Design a protein around this ligand. Structure first.
Ligand SMILES: [Cl-]
Ligand SMILES: [Cl-]
Ligand SMILES: [Cl-]
Ligand SMILES: [Cl-]
Lengths: 445, 445, 445, 445
């Protein structure tokens, strides 16, 4: 029978909480979602509501677009608690968290113990980790942070009410890498007890590379200092994930956070907080005040059930292939223009070519190139000039955008992130070739 | 011409940022949304993306349900900043914030200066206010809080890293009201400089009533202490809103926060932070780290454009009418069962009847009644027994659920919140009548 | 339990095939439709297809918009037969036909024996009746037809391959009515055996009125001639339906046909063929070659389940009320302009006011008025001048649009059909007032 | 600019009425459809309606699923006429007909002069052709028809009111082919003037093959007899289409009809009537009484714009590839079971393997095999036994399902039609292997 076949897949999902190997048909998925929504009290035929939060909906467009899931996730006192007024939404949350734990394993952190989706972006999710740690370490005021010029993760420390201690990176060839000795020197200077945590970063803009997590995990273990990893867009990278797995095996990592949109191709606004100590990850979840949106969870649930394990693995494989293609094409273009691809082997996602030939003419040509690319409908390229000075949440960054005060040259940043197509690379190369030719003609003529 | 008529309404909205008096047809709304989504770079026909956040979407179900709005709101460094990669989503955010400012005025706070939608629930939004105030008042550690037994707003203070100072309420007739003298005694005891803010509450469970905001505003003004108002579900009440307006006219109110779901009949997960000092409200917004979901904003935009000013006013009028109906019906039922409606004239939304006839038999009958109602598909009723002891985020509440250590009696709580129908009251009354008869027969026989 | 409540309604529908008294929630309806679609073999998870009609769909937009119902209705040899490849679509067809039989009863023909939805408009559905009758009456060549100036029902006879015999109407006061003596004179002239059927009409443009069905039913009974009734938009009228019921009680009516769009507020393209002799109605159905669209059936099923019996009755009641309102408003406007409402008491839907004051100036003012109304976004008004000559499918109509060669005056036609709102009448009156004033000023100045 | 890019594609479509080479994004398509729907008067903001057909819609689900296209296609007197009440739907119809003419050319009939979509299935569409020809040839009573055991196309002649003259096929090797001499003998016997048309068939169940259209076109040309081609599922086949093109070049073909679902992967219920003489094809269109559904047209429009020319060509290519794969796999399976693939080179879509090893045991094993396949979720396979006698619309077919009285053996029919996947063939082969093994074990043990 037809219905029994659909029921079989749903039962499989419910029993073991795992991603199906092959993606579900839309028919099975929508049957499932409708069944779940039926379980929420706001959708009961015989329901009457006499409270202030009854999940009433004014607009049919709003009700339909959310599959009639209105109550959000959690209870008033606990985002992790089953909501008796919303049994279907509760199940939705539970299954989604289980699917995500599974995917974290698949992606390369096979020892992850606990995780939960939180409907806040990565910056605010990092903030939530810091807020949790306040209560564990009431003497702490500082967060030690190897520099990365990204405003959200920087602001996350300030928003939490802590003082970032910015550790400058070491130039090693073309790469900017973790200054482990500076990290330790700051721990000793300020005192371990006064450090809330070390806040490290994996996926990042080239020529920075993922932090030396193994060595940082050892430092944190030895000094008894929490270690929080900003894995914003590292889940899509087996290299980044293995770094986290290794870190956890050789030392201390207390939490790692990743963006839903950047790793699962869904709207901005959700993140996953994960870790190796279940009580601690639970403590972070319990720190969340109030109910929360179910919308990011629904998105990732729809996405993972539709892809299956095989679909997601395929996307990860294709990203690695696109990285190789992007790198080859960009090196070819760069060398044709008397530039070079910066040697950034430790960065698995992000690449950079030099812009030495247009820089140094005192005409803002690097910044102009970024503008020209943007007007030609290239998005996500970063034209990084030298000498930017910017103050962000109380800290003045010299060489802002380059993750160092004195990076040797201007460069252009491109990346092969999940869901990239050959057309993205090909149009980019074609448009970049044209823009470079235009700038050089202007500077020459 | 047909298209020109639609364009006229869209232009009207764009020019003045105001709610249309009459609600838009679905056709106009969906034309508008599709036009806006077209403006986001991820939807450009000629686009190529070479970044880590390109708003790529894997599932067509996910893309469609969000009207192809994928980039969220804000920039990395600023949730209020226009996003050049998402011009349509930026406009969506700007218009939604303008519509909401207008509705706040319509609802009764005609002097509101600034507001923004934040895709977090009210608890976390209150937390964000406290996080902002940390930086203004680095010596402060305490938040003075007139007691209300609601876990989210309580946890919001703890999550922010502050010590709540719980002020017990005064029993005045049947009502529990603000103890102004206790509030002042604590300010003097602890020192104004050590108070982060006063955290007051408007809409609440009867027999508590909205806080004495005028008097609290004077205290805060005189002692130079910020005043943050938890208006979670008070926007739907002209009485609550006038209280805020009056508070701002006679003294100090720095921010007031309200729930999107509870006041606009949309999914849980969004809130509005509003105030009278634009730079300060802007400072709260700037404290948010990273981009955020556009989903709550889209929901309220769809809802407000569909209702128009007239539709929303109608809902507010109907809520007042349902309150009268609920009150009359509940008083009639109560008196028929030898109970009474508690005299709570200062509470415009929430009502309570006594449960003296089933209480005191040492059989947990009050709690049982709540269970019986729930199993009969009544949601949102609160059966409040005497003597609950509960510890929540480090504070032990005696008489938990009753907002006092020693409320004189057990009671049942019902409310007339926005979107309530006659059927809600009628089914509630019928089912409650039956449950009371059952409990009394059990206790009698 | 939640799901059981939905199942109860679905089981009720399936058991007795009747319209629910109250309309289903959207949630129940969409649960039902998804369940039905699951039953169609094209939606089976384990299906493989090796035929030329597998219900494959290329576009997801197409699949979704039709709720994954792709196989249509019927088998190759029989539109009424259960389709083993599409059990869900078969059930959809069966239930829809049962719901429609019920509604025909509700609407006033309580003795209807059999009916089926056919995904053709009324003209083609009338054609199908005539095609069926060919085989019953191989000697017949003529269809006797009391005149109505509507091209579809006229063409239906020609398309079927028969010669219409146009019977002119009798002017009785302001009304144009059936010439019973002319009908009989033609039967005698041509011979009963050479008449395929009498083709009568109920709902029609004023000042024509529904045909004298009782008397025509007697004539047909006595002469042994089939009687086919064009009830295109008469189902919405209890007066029209009672006329059919009475006709069937006092004489012969073999089939009556009505438009889905005009009576159920759904897209154009479907009709219902109904009758009192089940074998004969079955014979009409069996005359249909091939499978047919399920789209009109799905539309009416969604519509009737959503309205319930009460919702549909309400619409019928509201139409009667709008007719009274339209009549009162139009009479008032007419008399204000020195015109009058034509006395057409036997027409329950359509009304006419005279246009004597603008007619007769040799300037095409009547036709101009129709154009002016149209440009001011009034649709469905008919400005009928005198003296139109038009040849339609071989027949030359003098006085075309007026259903007579020599109607005494020009007039404007307005109607109160199902789903009309007060705004329709009010805007119409306002716009008509303005247009008349403009024409008269032009003719005066 | 973003919107301009979408406008460019829409303008391209509107100017030349041609299929885009590459498929449109969903965003462009839905922008277009919404723009078109805005043009229909029922969707005008300032509209008032005072007629009986105002395109009012009761259910929001119905309105939305049809993109607010409610008025259907055509005017009362003409399905081809622009509808002033529905300018958007009129444009929708015009563009769809233009796209389809283009695709007919692409598919292999490059000299097609005129075509139109009709929202009836192929049987009824054939009927419409015959109904048109009645008026051209009032002396005609017979339709000469080379036998094919398919009930719809057979019934189409009877429904139109004509006597089919069934011409038996010639067994040539394994193939059943047109008996040209029998066709001519009947023309001479009955008289050319008494023949309404020759009704030939292209795509068909093996071991029948497409009719000898070149030779039939010559016969029709010479005898002055219309030629109507049932191309139900031949459009997807360049072999079938070239046969039609050749027929038109060497003789007479007046019309050819094809199924929307079978060739374009959309719901059942639509067809395309096409021809080489524009006035005649126009005459067929004009024979349609009344307005008609726009739903099939919308489906094919969405489908063709989404695929583009390249997407449709790809599907045609893939069908040829799947035919080769199906043939190879079926021959391999057949020979493994001591059966053979019937030699049917002139049939490009449909294949047959012998069932001699299970036939002849007087146990209905062939029919049982068809049942067993069906219960194992194989659809579209035809198990054809010998000796079926069936009367269909007055004609008794001996050997029914085999297109001959005395086909030499029982066989199983499988086909590679458009949209077939490797999984369809692979599951079919696996399941067929199992079923054959089961039947043979039963017959052996
Ligand atoms: Cl990697
Ligand atoms: Cl109020
Ligand atoms: Cl009536
Ligand atoms: Cl072919």
């Amino acid at each position: 029978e037809a219905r029994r076949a659909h029921e079989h897949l749903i039962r499989l999902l419910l029993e073991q909480g795992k991603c199906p190997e092959d993606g579900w048909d839309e028919s099975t998925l929508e049957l499932f979602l409708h069944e779940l929504a039926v379980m929420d009290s706001n959708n009961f035929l015989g329901n009457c509501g006499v409270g202030e939060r009854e999940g009433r909906v004014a607009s049919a467009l709003v009700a339909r677009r959310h599959y009639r899931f209105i109550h959000g996730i959690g209870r008033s006192g606990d985002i992790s608690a089953v909501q008796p007024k919303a049994a279907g939404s509760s199940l939705l949350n539970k299954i989604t968290n289980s699917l995500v734990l599974n995917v974290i394993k698949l992606a390369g952190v096979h020892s992850v113990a606990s995780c939960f989706v939180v409907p806040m972006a990565t910056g605010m999710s990092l903030t939530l980790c810091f807020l949790t740690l306040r209560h564990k370490r009431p003497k702490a005021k500082y967060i030690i942070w190897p520099r990365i010029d990204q405003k959200s993760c920087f602001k996350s420390m300030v928003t939490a009410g802590f003082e970032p201690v910015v550790i400058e990176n070491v130039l090693e060839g073309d790469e900017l890498r973790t200054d482990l000795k500076a990290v330790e020197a700051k721990i000793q200077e300020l005192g371990p007890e006064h450090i809330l945590c070390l806040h490290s970063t994996t996926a990042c803009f080239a020529p920075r590379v993922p932090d030396r997590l193994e060595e940082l995990a050892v430092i944190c273990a030895n000094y008894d200092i929490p270690h929080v990893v900003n894995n914003a867009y590292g889940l899509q990278s087996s290299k980044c994930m293995h770094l986290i797995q290794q870190g956890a095996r050789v030392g201390r990592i207390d939490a790692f956070v990743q963006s839903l949109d950047k790793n699962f191709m869904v709207p901005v606004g959700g993140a996953i907080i994960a870790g190796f100590n279940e009580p601690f990850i639970q403590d972070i979840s319990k720190m969340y005040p109030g109910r929360a949106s179910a919308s990011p969870s629904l998105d990732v649930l729809i996405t993972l059930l539709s892809l299956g394990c095989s679909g997601y693995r395929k996307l990860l494989k294709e990203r690695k292939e696109m990285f190789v293609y992007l790198s080859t094409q960009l090196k070819k273009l760069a060398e044709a223009h008397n530039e070079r691809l910066l040697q950034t082997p430790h960065n698995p996602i992000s690449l950079a070519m030099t812009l030495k030939t247009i820089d140094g003419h005192h005409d803002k040509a690097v910044t102009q190139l970024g503008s020209m690319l943007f007007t030609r409908q290239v998005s996500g390229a970063r034209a990084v000039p030298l000498g930017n000075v910017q103050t962000v949440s109380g800290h003045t960054f010299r060489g802002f955008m380059s993750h160092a005060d004195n990076y040797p040259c201007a460069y252009l940043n491109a990346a092969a992130a999940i869901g990239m197509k050959m057309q993205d690379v090909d149009l980019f190369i074609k448009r970049l070739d044209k823009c470079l030719n235009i700038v050089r003609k202007e500077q020459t003529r």
